[PDB]
Amino acid sequence: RPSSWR
Amino acid sequence: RPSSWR
Amino acid sequence: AMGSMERASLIQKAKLAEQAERYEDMAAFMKGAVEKGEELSCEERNLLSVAYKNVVGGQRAAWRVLSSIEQKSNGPEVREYREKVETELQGVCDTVLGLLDSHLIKEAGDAESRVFYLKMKGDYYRYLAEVATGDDKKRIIDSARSAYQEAMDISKKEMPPTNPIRLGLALNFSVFHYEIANSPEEAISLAKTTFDEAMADLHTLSEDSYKDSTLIMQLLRDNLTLWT
Amino acid sequence: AMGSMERASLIQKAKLAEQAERYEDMAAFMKGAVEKGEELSCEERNLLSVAYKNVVGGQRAAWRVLSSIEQKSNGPEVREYREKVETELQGVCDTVLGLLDSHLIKEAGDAESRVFYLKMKGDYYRYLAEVATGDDKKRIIDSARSAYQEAMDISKKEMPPTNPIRLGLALNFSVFHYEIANSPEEAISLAKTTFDEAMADLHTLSEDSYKDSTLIMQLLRDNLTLWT
Numbered sequence: 001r002p003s004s005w006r
Numbered sequence: 007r008p009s010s011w012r
Numbered sequence: 013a014m015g016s017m018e019r020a021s022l023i024q025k026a027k028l029a030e031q032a033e034r035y036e037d038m039a040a041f042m043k044g045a046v047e048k049g050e051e052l053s054c055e056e057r058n059l060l061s062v063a064y065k066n067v068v069g070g071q072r073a074a075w076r077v078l079s080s081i082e083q084k085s086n087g088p089e090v091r092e093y094r095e096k097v098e099t100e101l102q103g104v105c106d107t108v109l110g111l112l113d114s115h116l117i118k119e120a121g122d123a124e125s126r127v128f129y130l131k132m133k134g135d136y137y138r139y140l141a142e143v144a145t146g147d148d149k150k151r152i153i154d155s156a157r158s159a160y161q162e163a164m165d166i167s168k169k170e171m172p173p174t175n176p177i178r179l180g181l182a183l184n185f186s187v188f189h190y191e192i193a194n195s196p197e198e199a200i201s202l203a204k205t206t207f208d209e210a211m212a213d214l215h216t217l218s219e220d221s222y223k224d225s226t227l228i229m230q231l232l233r234d235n236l237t238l239w240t
Numbered sequence: 241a242m243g244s245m246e247r248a249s250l251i252q253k254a255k256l257a258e259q260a261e262r263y264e265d266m267a268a269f270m271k272g273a274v275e276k277g278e279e280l281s282c283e284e285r286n287l288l289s290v291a292y293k294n295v296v297g298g299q300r301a302a303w304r305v306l307s308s309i310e311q312k313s314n315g316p317e318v319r320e321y322r323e324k325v326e327t328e329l330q331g332v333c334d335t336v337l338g339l340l341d342s343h344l345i346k347e348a349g350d351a352e353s354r355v356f357y358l359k360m361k362g363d364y365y366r367y368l369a370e371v372a373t374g375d376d377k378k379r380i381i382d383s384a385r386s387a388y389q390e391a392m393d394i395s396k397k398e399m400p401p402t403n404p405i406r407l408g409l410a411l412n413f414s415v416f417h418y419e420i421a422n423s424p425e426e427a428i429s430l431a432k433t434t435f436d437e438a439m440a441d442l443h444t445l446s447e448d449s450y451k452d453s454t455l456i457m458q459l460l461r462d463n464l465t466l467w468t
């Protein structure tokens with residue numbers, strides 16, 4: 001659910 | 007560009 | 013590679029692969045199921061079609077990107093990589109056509125199954141035609157035409173005008189006429205005639221069948237709007 | 241398999257594969273480029289990272305779909321297919337980690353390159369940790385932690401607080417803390433401290449660098465909003 005780098 | 011079945 | 017897995021397990025895993033959007037796996041599972049030698053149910057035919065349509069669809073999209081880059085350029089890398097993707101696409105088409113020829117079509121006696129497989133055969137020859145440029149381009153186009161035509165003849169004799177397979181077949185045959193055969197007037201005539209006769213048969217349908225049929229009639233209308 | 245292709249041709253084809261959204265091909269091309277034995281430029285490191293992040297990203301998404309189906313169920317098919325996807329994911333992670341260990345990291349002397357590769361090492365051990373359940377789960381987690389920690393130490397000594405690699409590293413290390421290490425307070429503290437020190441350094445940046453840095457600070461803020 002949380003954002004890692006993209 | 008034109009639609010085939012999908 | 014799937015010879016040791018149960019037919020039912022291959023079908024179940026094909027459905028799991030669809031949910032996971034793993035269409036390569038899905039196609040491999042359905043190829044294994046076909047190679048068990050038993051005829052396919054309606055649901056199983058749809059799984060086979062969805063799997064390979066998604067696989068070849070990604071290859072066709074990639075080929076079009078690379079072909080566009082190649083045209084704007086004309087080192088060998090762009091051509092080489094376009095050729096690589098093109099060869100992989102042709103291999104998938106050959107695999108599907110091989111499954112239809114060995115032995116799905118010859119065992120398909122019912123109109124729903126036979127028209128479904130012949131539509132598939134027309135579609136995958138159409139995909140071969142999209143990338144073909146050599147001495148066999150005309151024969152590939154005529155193989156698509158012949159498969160679509162036999163499917164059309166059966167569908168008009170054996171199915172109502174609102175049948176979703178009949179409608180999708182006519183949609184794709186009209187796209188064949190417009191994009192492959194350089195016959196835009198034939199494409200428009202087929203799409204309009206198909207739409208109008210379906211319209212006139214909608215009154216016979218349940219609410220669910222009505223939704224199925226009108227969904228595909230909308231695609232016919234979208235093309236007519238694009239083409240006229 | 242790429243040993244016979246020129247390094248420059250592999251790089252050019254990796255860029256073509258990205259445009260075609262053929263990330264498996266992209267990763268194979270960049271693997272071949274790495275195996276030429278020369279260090280990677282900034283742009284080339286980004287190509288390597290983008291390729292494998294997209295490949296493993298699709299595997300992780302599929303694994304999560306299948307794992308969810310498996311939990312709701314608990315025949316062997318769901319477990320078998322989840323295990324198949326999981327094994328393929330672990331193979332990709334092992335391949336990336338093998339490239340970092342042979343010999344990208346040991347030849348990376350500059351802060352930008354060394355932090356980049358150590359962040360990658362933490363990321364792919366994190367992906368292994370997401371599916372790990374056996375006797376090596378703790379060691380896999382500590383391998384991720386150790387790689388992230390060394391990257392953090394170098395980045396805090398050698399890069400400004402707005403450096404995009406430093407920011408993305410802190411973002412991912414905070415996700416590691418929250419999702420893998422069961423340390424949500426550490427995750428929140430790292431994200432807030434990283435965001436605040438970046439905020440205070442934005443005044444030194446050009447318009448283009450400001451856009452690069454604020455883009456990643458927004459991801460830190462999104463997580464903080466999710467977590468608090």
Ligand SMILES: *Cc1ccc(-n2cnc(C)c2)cc1
Pocket residue numbers: 011061131176177179180181224
């Ligand atoms: C080629 C083709 C056309 C239409 C269908 N379809 C859509 N909805 C149903 C019940 C069948 C499948 C394949």
Ligand SMILES: *Cc1ccc(-n2cnc(C)c2)cc1
Pocket residue numbers: 005289359404405407408409452
């Ligand atoms: C892991 C990571 C973080 C940030 C970048 N990035 C974004 N924009 C630039 C110039 C660098 C790449 C990779």
Ligand SMILES: [Ca+2]
Pocket residue numbers: 051119120121122
């Ligand atoms: Ca039969």
Ligand SMILES: [Ca+2]
Pocket residue numbers: 279347348349350
């Ligand atoms: Ca060096």
Ligand SMILES: [Cl-]
Pocket residue numbers: 092093096253
């Ligand atoms: Cl190639």
Ligand SMILES: [Cl-]
Pocket residue numbers: 025320321324
């Ligand atoms: Cl499996």
